RNA sequence: GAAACCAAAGUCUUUGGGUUCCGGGGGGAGUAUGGUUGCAAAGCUGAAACUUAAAGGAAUUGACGGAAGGGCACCACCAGG
RNA sequence: UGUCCUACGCCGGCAGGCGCGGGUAACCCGUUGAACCCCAUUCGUGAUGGGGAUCGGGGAUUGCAAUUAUUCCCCAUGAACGAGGAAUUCCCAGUAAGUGCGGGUCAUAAGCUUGCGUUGAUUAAGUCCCUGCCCUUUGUACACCGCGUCGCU
């Protein structure tokens, strides 16, 4: 965990800068883009390579380094922490291959959940669409709890990581025996009907994406696949669903089906589918940037100065003279 | 309005993955349309179609 | 001739045909000040303190392309078990 | 495969003991007498007799020693498990898969590993879509504009 917290976020978004125009970022630039402190930042870099947080990458001609996964889950949960949204952690871990589930205490000591996208050509492209996947599911969140659907309320999101509302559950795969099937499945039809009139078909709603809140309540989450009604396709992905669900219910729970909705509804309700005049401050705020940037400059192409071909240069000539 | 078909010549194979075959087809209605379409599946010269609708002509150009 | 190139950018250490302007590592800086002209905009002349181990000019190979074409594989896919 | 591999008889529910023979091996195990599969009986869509774990008692081997069950045998308890998402492995014809057998450290210890036979298919014979890999041509030795307010000595 953390426990000096004054420039490992100034290095570290200075990484992070340096990762959105080019693979492996170089000393130098972090060094010019990252100016609050100068000097120690080599052994800043060396404290932070002890952990997981950075790495080194010296083939041979290029030296810098990247930013690993966990340096930049740190990053997200140091500026959620920043918002002062998550205070400890809970260690229920839902580890999955496309997100990581930890639960996260803010200090009022409620408890939320944390999303942490792992998408799995190196790693810069895994970050990039693990940040996009985050972004346009936290939007889909954001959508589907404005529009009054059965899910838990968004919270926050940095770049990765979504808090989000936690609610107690199990899949509705591993609960074997449900005491009212009927109640539940013509809930089930009822959001099925409730999603196709939103003008949203889900493609693949699956039993296990379903979390029984107590076998009660109804948790859905895990939408970065969703798609349009105005496909041609939609209705067959709807009636995929829905047989899906029905072969499901006849097949787990020995309960036949009473009521059969076939209905495509488009669209009744929102379309989701697209989802000295001048003072002198001025001057002298003006004059400022300019000169920090002359001198970010400067520290650029003065950081900017291989000791490597110099140290194989002397071993060369000293093979040559001790050798002939 | 249902027609038969015959396969004069095999083209090639298109596709995404390499599934489809482009063919030729000549019509048993005693006509000369040849009309090159698009088949899934294993097609030989000589093979005779089922086609659900022949308004449709496929990618040609 | 550093070369790309040049019948001139040749007749240059075998260095002198006449003559005008003008450069002296990169910045500061064509800046400040002074003078002068202009209605003005600005034009002409034009520093220093300080800063710096470099900045540039020609060519020579080609990691890497987010440049393009081909070929191969059920440790890739398609249709399947 | 074998000097621990076992043929035969007796005592045996039963693992196993007892008296006897062969084999340092195309000979004896061993026509290697296999298993799915087939032919008849019963069960009859339910946590069922499916599935067998986890426990309770006895018995017999292996070993100087089995208590933290070595192993197997005889009764009894019957759990989860109702065809399994995201994702992922292997596979082109005696092939996958099902089914048994043999070798490997070894006194008894084999859900591991490696080969062998038996029953034996669906699909495809196409492609650069994905994942990569291998060549050819071709150019190249982080520039500019879009991080801050206040506080005392």
């Given amino acids: ?324 | 309005p249902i027609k038969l078909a015959r396969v004069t010549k095999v083209l090639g194979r298109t596709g995404s993955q390499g599934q489809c075959t482009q063919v030729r087809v000549e019509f048993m209605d005693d006509t000369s349309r040849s009309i090159i379409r698009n088949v899934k599946g294993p097609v030989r010269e000589g093979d005779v179609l089922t086609l659900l609708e022949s308004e449709r002509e496929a990618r040609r150009l």
């Fill in chain 1, 1 to 324: 965990l953390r426990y000096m917290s004054r420039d490992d976020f100034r290095v570290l978004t200075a990484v992070e800068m340096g990762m959105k125009n080019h693979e492996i970022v170089p000393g130098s630039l972090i060094a010019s883009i990252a100016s609050l402190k100068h000097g120690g930042c080599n052994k800043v870099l060396r404290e932070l390579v002890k952990h997981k947080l950075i790495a080194w990458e010296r083939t041979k001609t290029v030296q810098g380094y990247r930013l690993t996964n966990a340096g930049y889950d740190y990053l997200a949960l140091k500026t959620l922490s920043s918002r002062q949204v998550v205070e400890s952690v809970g260690n229920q871990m839902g580890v999955g291959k496309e997100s990581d589930i930890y639960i996260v205490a803010n200090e009022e000591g409620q408890q939320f959940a944390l999303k942490l996208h792992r998408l799995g050509r190196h790693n810069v492209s895994w970050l990039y669409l693990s940040r996009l996947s985050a972004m346009k599911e936290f939007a889909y969140m954001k959508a589907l709890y404005e529009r009054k659907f059965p899910v838990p309320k968004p919270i926050d999101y940095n770049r990765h990581a979504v808090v989000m509302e936690l609610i107690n559950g199990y899949p509705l795969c591993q609960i074997h025996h449900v005491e009212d099937p009927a109640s539940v499945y013509d809930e089930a039809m009822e959001l099925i009907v409730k999603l196709a009139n939103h003008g949203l078909i889900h493609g693949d709603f699956n039993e296990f994406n379903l979390i029984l809140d107590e076998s009660d309540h109804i948790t859905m989450i895990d939408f970065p696949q969703m798609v349009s009604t105005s496909h041609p396709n939609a209705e067959w992905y709807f009636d995929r669903d829905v047989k899906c669900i029905k072969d499901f219910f006849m097949k787990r729970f020995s309960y036949e089906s009473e009521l059969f909705p076939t209905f495509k509804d488009i669209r009744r309700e929102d379309t989701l589918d697209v989802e000295s005049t001048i003072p002198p401050e001025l001057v002298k705020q003006k004059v400022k940037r300019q000169l920090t940037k002359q001198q970010k400059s400067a520290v650029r192409r003065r950081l900017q100065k291989a000791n490597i071909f110099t140290k194989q240069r002397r071993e060369n000539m000293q093979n040559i003279k001790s050798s002939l």
